[PDB]
Each structure stands twice: as structure tokens, then as C-alpha cells.
């Protein structure tokens, strides 16, 4: 019998166990292929598909492009697969082709993708966000940094931030959010969460990174407010904590909540004198979030100020993650992302070997909980299989792909 | 402007030129990334996605599984992408979960996939077939060789071949097709072609390989008939030539017609005494097809008799292709398939270097026209990009995947 997968409205073969599951788990299994519990869920490995904007939506709606992109990766067994930044409001989109969730119909298109994910026994999350003062741009392949004009679908008069400070001369100048705007954003956040639950997502991630709205509020270089939302570390994180409280009130306690942070503005160098968001701030914020229902700290960085000075290279953000991990300990899970180019590096980052970027081969060590990968998956949707073979781990793959190699 | 792709009923960014296209074509460009004209079409490279049964259909209908599998590969730019063996009749299916095209509704599900293919500027074909005496089996991951019983969806009393000779003790014993059955198969073939054209396929491939119905008729080890369809080389290929004539009468002269042949039964060894289908027969058949509207000879082999003795390894079927190519010359294109594991081997097979399997690195040489790959794509849907990088060829990729690496 070609057993059907339960709980979905179309026939497809059951994948038991799901793709990406180590077939002979033992104490010698690399941590990368070890399961990870998070609230009610169990990821079968520690490789997460990072959220990746596709700039291919139709008035915020997914299309067959998204099914081919996500469905092709998800069938190859990432422990967790995260959908791209999805705006809770039209004017929160990065571009006119960004994913959105201000409409019930957008949720119904998302549902098609989570039903495919669940037909495979895979877990899928959604990153909710709002682009703030970086909103209304054009797709990056059209131009690294150019605005979407009103006739090209843009919305210059609705771009909003915590302060009336443009990111650059190439972006629009935002309106400073009134208290009414802040409340409208909180209401829209709640309405998008209900749509996300109804489409069936297994985890929600709060986007607090990459110079978007929530990152703009936490950083003093972009948030000059003098109300309850500015002027001190506690005020500047208030909006983030209110978003966490709203979320934890609405989603099931059984459901993991992730938060992606930009660990630093990369303005912590000599020559730049203004105050900025630093990894110490992110660590202190992590400590506070660990007690308010956030289960995982996705650690990225940068993209909040055009004068940033980034030291890039293999695993360049993992040191931030390890410093945040050292302060939250076992109170919260920490995931690292950014140029993790091998299963060996990944296994090193998770197990605390190879140094703070895990690239060293010699010789203590801060352990991390989860590895996150974006560009690796775009080049090879079968990255999980490639890393499993690189590390000598026999894994399950989809029945359709397996029997050809026996 | 994020220009829309024309001619499809959903918005998606135009890919101009399509993915897999060499960006700086010149006399030094490897033949593998050189364009190939076939009737009205131009493949942008010489890498074809081989047809691969998924055993995931619902009463012959595609599902979201097929969109995720095919759509994920097609967006990464194979010169041509071929859909799996699709039965023109219910009892022609390899298993109860095989693709089918005896219903208009099956054509409408196929259309969704070709609209995605065309939204990407990619070319897509369909392999039509009928499993003959190998019909009504279970998916191979359930068991290498076991029958689908009547309560497991099987159809023992309808399994049909040219002669009442079972493939093995593990298969059903077929009924020998009456002249009426042969006419019913020809009628169903015509009806499936119209559905294929209406779904918008760009090429049709006749499945004459792997021990299915048409291979059974050509080989004397499986076809013992004494009517116009047996007893001589000309009679045993008559059904194949009638299928070609029907096809060329129905599809546009502008549309390429492919035919996949099993170059040999692999019974041409000492110890086995019965007469069999050999590469000389396939070459003589190729010569006849070259004058009857067949544009490409897909060269595979085997799977018609359980006593076959296969000499496998890298490029093991390419010698057959080169021998068929030597007899048809420029009258027909020839493609090779089977353990082509590298862009270098592939480039060697097409350009006539590296020996008859292209694995040699030393030192004339029969040139081939097209390289076909199945398992390579399942492991890495991005194989075209991987082979382009291996050969030093700058290629276009989808906008969504490209800008991240600049
Ligand atoms: C095309 C593309 C789209 C991305 N979209 C998002 C996004 O929607 N949300 C997000 O938080 N990060 C996004 N990122 C950043 C990646 O998720 C990832 O953190 C970064 O690319 C570094 O990881 P990598 O080196 O594995 O690619 C995107 C990156 C790329 C290349
Ligand atoms: C899962 C699977 C399904 C296949 N389905 C088909 C099919 O439907 N039609 C066909 O002609 N060949 C089919 N084949 C054979 C392949 O197309 C190909 O000719 C063979 O696998 C050798 O090529 P490769 O070494 O590149 O995989 C299939 C092979 C596999 C592994």
C-alpha cells in the first residue's frame, strides 16, 4: 500500500519518518543531525531554512513561484522551514512585490504551502514584519537601492518610522509614527497572527532585524523619540516587548515564538561617534526576552545605517550568537546564520569547536542550538542531504528520491 | 519596474534571458552551454531533465507534489524538462499512483505545471507511454518487484502485452493484445496527444524503452506474434511506426517529436541463446525513424527481460548512442543518458572527447547532441548551475536567486 499522508486535502505518499531524519541516532551522531525540542515541537535536525524574500508576490499574495521555491526545499528536509518577511500592513512591504498578510485571502494562499509542508511531515514557520523607513523600494535585482515611485507601485506618503530620519538619500524620508500609528501597527500585528494560525503555521518569528521597523525602534541611531518609546534602553525596546506580549497572548502556549535580532548596527568603531545598537544591548535584550516567552534568538546583524562597517566572512555573525548565548544560557535557544558554508563548520558552531566562527581545525567552546542557512539552499535545495553525506550521517530522504540510489 | 512574465494567468517576474543561458556565448563556450535548435524551438543549453516517475499521482492526476518537484528544477534552467511517463490508458500505468492522460481533467492539472514552466521562459515536454506487461505493480520503495493486487488498486485481469509471456514470476501474466486492443491503444494515444497539446507542452516524447509496451513489441524475446505485428524486424517495429505516423499527423510540424529507445535488451551474451533486441536493431530503427518525423533519439537500454546482463558505470549507455549517431548522422539528433556525473564528462560526450563513455583524460570522436540527467537533478535541483561553475561558464539564473551572490 502506498500509504497516504494524513490531514491534507490531496493524496501524497506518507514520509515516515520525515526527510532529514537521522536513521541511526546514537551518541556519535553529529549534533547537527540530533533532534531539538522547542515547546510542543521536535525538529528532526538543526538546519533551518532561513527566510528569503522572493519579491514575486501579487498584492502580497503567494503564487506558484512560491510553491516551487519553498516546496522544493521543504521536501528535502530542513529541520524547520521559515517563510519570508511578511508585512502585517500594505505600507510595511519592502517592495510592491513583497509577501503580505493584511488580507484573509493572503492567508489562504499561504495555507497551500503549509499543507504541502505538513503532507511531508515537515515544520514551517512565518516571519512577520514591517519595513518601517526602508519600505517602498524596488526589487534589488532592478537596483541595489532605488525607490518605488508612486507610478511604479510605491507609496512615498505612507512610509513610516520611529523618527523622521531617512536611512539614506536613496530612500524615502519617513513620517515619525504617532501614538495612533503605533496602535494601528499593534492591531495589524494581532490580525496577521490570527491569519497565520488559521493557515496552520507551526512557529512564528518576530522580525526585529535588518533595519526594519522594530530594529529602527531599538537602535538610538534611528530612534530619536522623546515619548515612552525613546530616550533610554527601556523605552527603545518597549515596542518590541509589547509585540512579544501581544503575540504570546494570541498564539498557543504550545507554539514556539522566535525573534530575529540584528546583534549590532556595526557602528561600534572609532571615527563614527553617534551612539548605536551593540551586541551588549542585544544580549541584555535577549536576557529580558528569555523571561517573556521567546524560545529562540535568531542572531543576524546590520542593515540599519549606511555607514555600517561589516567584517564579513565564514560564520562572521556566530561570535555575536555565542555572546548572546553566554548570557541567556539554557533559558533560551540561540541560532546562528550567515556564511555557514559546510556541515563541518555547522557542526563546529553547534558543538563549540573550531573557534567562535567554527572555521579553525586545531585544539571550552560556547555551544549553540540551531544553524540557519539562506543562500546555501538557493544554490542547492538538497543541502541537507549534501551536509549529511559530508558528515557521514545516513538520513531519510523522500521515498520518490531514495529508491533510485539503492 | 518588476516586469511581469507574459502569457500566464498569474504575476511573476520575467526571466530574460531564461535561467541556464550562457551570458557570453563565444567559440570557446563549452558545447554543453551552447544553444540547440530543434524544429521551431531553441534549447538554451544541452542539459535535459530526464523523465522521472514520482508514483505520487491521484487517479493519474498531478498534485502539489509534482509542482514542488518539477517547478523546483525547472526554475533552475534545464535546456528542456521532461515530465514522467504518462499512461494513455488506465491499465497502462506502471502503478496505481502513476501519471495518466486518459481524462481531460488530468490535462488541466498538467497545464498548471507548463504554465509555471512558461512563466520562466523554459521548455517542457511530456513522455507518453503504456506499461504493457509491466503494468499494475507497486511503487518501488514498497518493494522492488511485487504486484498491486486488486484490493491494493491493481488490475490483474487487464494487463496486456504483444504476447502472453510474463516478464517474471513476480509480475502478472499479460493477455496478448487482439487487433481490437491495438486499435484501442492507437485511439487512446491520439486522444492523449490532443490533451497534451491543449495543456501546452512544447515537445512530445514516445516511450519505446524500459520493457514497456512499445519495447515489448520491438523485441523478439517478448513479441511472439504471427500477425502483421510479429515474426520479422519490419513487423515488430510496425506498431512503433504507426504510433509515429499518428503523432506527426496530430501535432504541429513546428513541434519536436522525441523517441526514447532501449538500445539493447542486454541479452547479447554467450550462455543466453534466445534472439533479442540489439544495438544494431536500434540503429536500423533509428535510420527508419529519421525519415518519418522523429527529431531526437533518446538512448537508454534494458529492463525488458529479467536475465539481462548490464555493464553499468559512468556513461555506460553513451556507446550505444554514439553507434546510433554514426548511422543517422545529421538526419536526427541523439541524446545520451545514464550516470553522466559531471559537466566535464557531459562536455566530453557532446564534443566527442574522452572516449565512448567520455571518462578518459588523454589523446576523431562521435559527437552527440544532448545530455540527459535524472538522479543528478533529484540530489541537486541546481545541477545546471553546479555544472556551469565546474566548467567556468557564466550563466543567467533566476533574478530571485542571483542578486544574493553579487
Ligand atoms: C534573496 C534573499 C532574501 C532574504 N530575505 C530575508 C528575509 O525575508 N528576512 C530575513 O530576515 N532575512 C532575509 N535574508 C537574509 C538571509 O536570511 C540570511 O540571514 C543571510 O542571507 C545570511 O545567510 P546566508 O549566508 O546563509 O545566506 C535574505 C537573503 C537573501 C539572499
Ligand atoms: C525515480 C526514477 C524515475 C524514473 N522514471 C522514468 C520514467 O518515467 N521514464 C523514463 O523513461 N525513465 C525513467 N527513469 C530513468 C531515468 O530517466 C534515467 O534514464 C536513468 O535514471 C539513468 O539516468 P541517471 O543516471 O541520470 O539517473 C527514472 C529513474 C528514476 C531513478
Enter the C-alpha cell of residue B226. Answer: 504471427
**Residue B286, annotated as binding a ligand:** no
Query: Is the CB of B271 inside a 6 Å radius of any atom of ligand 1?
Result: no
The beta-carbon neighbor of B400 closest among A56, A75, A401 is A56
Query: Which residue minimizes the CA distance to atom 18 of ligand 2?
Result: B374
Contact B71 A74 (CB under 8 A): no
Strands B160-161 and B175-176, how do they pair?
A: parallel
**CA–CA distance, A153 with A136 (Å, rounded to integer):** 8
Q: Please give the Cα distance from B329 to B290 (Å, whole number).
A: 10
Q: Please tell me the distance from the alpha carbon of residue A265 to that of residue A305, in angstroms, as a whole number.
A: 7
Q: Does A313 touch chain B (CB under 8 A)?
A: no
Chain position carrying cell 550563466: B395
In order of B17, B24, B259, B376, the CA distances from B21 in angstroms are 7, 9, 25, 19
| Bridge partner residues of A298 (DSSP) | A260, A335
Residue among B50, B343, B373 whose CB has most ligand 2 atoms within 8 A, to mutate: B50
CA distances from A66 to A11, A69, A98, A176, A264 (A): 20, 5, 12, 34, 31
Those residues with Cβ within 8 angstroms of residue A143's Cβ, 6 or more apart along the chain or in another chain = none
Ligand closest to the CA atom of residue B125? 2
Please name which of A285, A287, A288, A312 lies closest in space to residue A301, comparing C-alpha atoms. Answer: A312
DSSP A345-391: HHHHHHHT-SSTTS----------SEEEESHHHHH-TTHHHHHHHHH
A127 known ligand binder: yes
Q: Alpha-carbon distance B221 to B167, whole Å?
A: 10
Q: What is the CA(B132)–ligand 2 centre distance, in A? A: 18
Beta strands in A209-294 (DSSP E): 257-262
Backbone angles phi, psi at A189, to 5 degrees: -60, -45
Q: Whose CA is nearest to atom 4 of ligand 1?
A: A52
CA-closest candidate to residue A209, choices A363, A321, A315: A321
Please tell me what DSSP assigns to residue A4.
B
Task: Count interface pairs A-B at CB distance under 8 A.
Answer: 154
Alpha-carbon dihedral angle through residues A269, A219, A297, A141, given to the nearest 10 degrees: -80
Separation in Å, CA of A214 to nearest CA in chain B: 23
**φ and ψ at residue A205, rounded to 5 degrees:** -120, 130
Residues in chain B closer than 8 A to A399 (CB atoms): 55, 139, 141
Domain ranges of chain A: 21-405
Rounded Cα distance, A373 and A360, in Å: 20
Quick check: A11 and B58 CB within 8 A? yes
Contact A1 B152 (CB under 8 A): yes
Is A380 in contact with B386 (Cβ distance < 8 A)?
Answer: yes
How close, in Å, is residue B176 to chain A by CA atoms?
28
Residue of A nearest to B66 (CA): A68
Do the beta carbons of residue A45 and residue A78 sit within 8 Å?
Answer: yes
Measure in Å the smallest separation between the Cα of A235 and chain B Cα atoms: 35
Q: What are B58's strand-pairing partners?
A: B61
Contact B99, B196 (CB under 8 A): no
Q: How far apart are CA B130 and CA B128, in angstroms?
A: 7
SS3 call for A282 = helix
3-class DSSP assignment, residue A229: coil
- The nearest CA of chain A is from the CA of B151 a distance in Å of 10
User: Is the CB of A64 less than 8 angstroms away from the CB of B69?
Assistant: no
Is residue A5 a known part of a binding site?
A: no
Within B75-204, where are the H helices?
Answer: 104-119, 179-199
Residues in B closer than 8 angstroms to A67, CB to CB, are 64, 67-68, 71
Resolution of the solved structure (Å)? 2.2
Q: Is B127 exposed, middle or buried, given 0-12, 13-18 or 19+ CB atoms closer than 10 A?
A: buried
Fold of domain B21-405: TIM Barrel (3.20.20)
Ligand nearest to the CA of B300: 2
Cα-atom radius of gyration of chain A, to the nearest Å?
21
Q: In Å, what is the CA distance from B311 to each residue of B25, B264, B268, B345, B355?
A: 37, 12, 12, 18, 16
**Is A379 near chain B, with CB under 8 Å?**
yes
Judged by a CB distance cut-off of 8 A, whether residue A73 touches chain B is yes
Q: Are B127 and B85 in contact (CB under 8 A)?
A: yes
Q: Could you tell me if the CB of A395 is within 6 A of ligand 1?
A: no
List of chain A residues whose C-beta atoms are within 8 Å of the C-beta of residue B112: 64
Phi-psi region of B159 (alpha: psi -120 to 50; beta: other; left: phi over 0): beta
Give the distance, in angstroms, between the CA of residue B258 and the centroid of all CA atoms in the same chain: 8
Nearest protein CA to atom 22 of ligand 2, as residue: B338
Smallest Cα–Cα separation from A285: which of A344, A356, A345, A235? A235
Q: Do A116 and B379 touch (CB under 8 A)?
A: no
A219 interfaces chain B, CB cutoff of 8 Å: no
Q: Is residue A262 classed as helix, strand or coil in its secondary structure?
A: strand
Lookup result for grid cell 509589547:
A242
| Experimental method, per PDB record | X-ray
- Within an 8 Å CB–CB cutoff, is residue B390 touching chain A? no
The answer to whether A271 and A277 have CB atoms below 8 angstroms apart is no
Strand B36-38 and strand B41-43: the pairing is antiparallel
Residues with C-beta less than 6 Å from any ligand 2 atom: A 404; B 50-53, 84-85, 127, 207, 209-210, 260, 300, 337-339, 373-376
Amino acid at each position: 500500500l502506498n500509504t497516504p499522508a494524513p490531514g491534507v486535502p490531496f493524496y501524497t505518499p506518507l514520509q515516515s519518518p520525515p526527510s532529514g531524519t537521522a536513521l541511526h541516532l546514537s551518541p556519535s551522531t553529529p549534533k547537527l543531525f540530533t533532534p531539538l525540542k522547542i515547546r510542543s515541537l521536535t525538529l528532526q535536525n538543526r538546519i533551518m531554512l532561513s527566510p528569503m524574500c522572493q519579491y514575486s508576490a501579487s498584492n502580497g499574495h503567494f503564487t506558484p513561484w512560491h510553491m516551487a521555491h519553498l516546496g522544493g526545499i521543504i521536501s528535502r528536509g530542513p529541520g524547520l522551514s521559515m517563510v519570508e518577511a511578511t508585512s502585517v500592513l500594505p505600507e510595511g512591504r519592502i517592495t510592491p512585490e513583497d509577501s503580505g498578510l493584511w488580507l484573509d485571502s493572503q492567508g489562504d494562499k499561504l495555507k497551500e504551502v503549509v499543507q504541502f509542508a505538513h503532507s511531508q511531515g515537515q515544520l514551517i514557520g512565518i516571519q512577520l514584519s514591517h519595513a518601517g523607513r526602508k519600505a517602498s523600494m524596488v526589487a534589488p535585482w532592478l537596483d541595489r537601492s532605488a525607490v518605488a515611485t508612486e507610478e511604479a507601485g510605491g507609496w512615498p506618503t505612507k512610509v513610516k518610522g520611529p523618527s523622521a530620519i531617512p536611512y539614506d538619500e536613496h530612500h524615502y524620508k519617513p513620517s515619525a509614527m504617532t501614538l495612533e500609528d503605533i496602535q494601528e501597527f499593534k492591531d495589524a500585528w494581532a490580525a496577521s497572527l490570527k491569519r497565520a494560525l488559521k493557515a496552520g503555521f507551526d512557529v512564528i518569528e518576530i522580525h526585529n532585524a535588518h533595519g526594519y521597523l522594530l530594529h529602527e525602534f531599538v537602535s538610538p541611531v534611528s530612534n530619536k523619540r522623546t515619548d515612552q518609546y525613546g530616550g533610554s534602553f527601556e523605552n527603545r525596546i518597549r515596542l518590541t516587548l509589547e509585540i512579544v506580549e501581544i503575540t504570546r497572548k494570541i498564539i498557543p502556549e504550545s507554539m514556539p515564538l522566535f525573534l530575529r535580532i540584528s546583534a549590532t548596527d556595526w557602528l561600534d568603531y572609532e571615527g563614527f561617534g553617534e551612539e548605536s545598537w551593540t551586541v551588549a544591548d542585544s544580549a541584555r535584550l535577549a536576557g529580558i526576552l528569555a523571561d517573556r516567552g521567546v524560545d529562540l534568538m535568531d542572531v543576524s546583524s546590520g542593515a540599519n545605517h549606511p555607514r555600517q562597517k561589516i567584517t564579513a566572512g565564514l560564520g562572521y555573525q556566530a561570535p555575536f550568537a555565542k555572546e548572546i548565548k553566554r548570557v541567556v544560557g539554557e533559558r533560551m535557544l540561540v541560532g546562528t546564520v550567515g556564511m555557514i558554508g559546510s556541515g563541518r563548520q555547522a557542526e563546529g558552531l553547534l558543538s563549540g569547536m573550531g573557534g567562535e566562527r567554527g572555521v579553525d581545525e586545531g585544539e571550552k567552546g560556547t555551544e549553540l542550538d540551531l544553524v540557519i542557512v539562506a543562500r546555501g539552499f538557493q544554490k542547492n535545495p538538497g543541502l541537507v542531504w549534501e551536509w549529511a553525506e559530508e558528515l557521514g550521517v545516513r538520513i531519510m530522504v523522500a521515498h520518490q528520491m531514495r529508491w533510485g540510489f539503492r
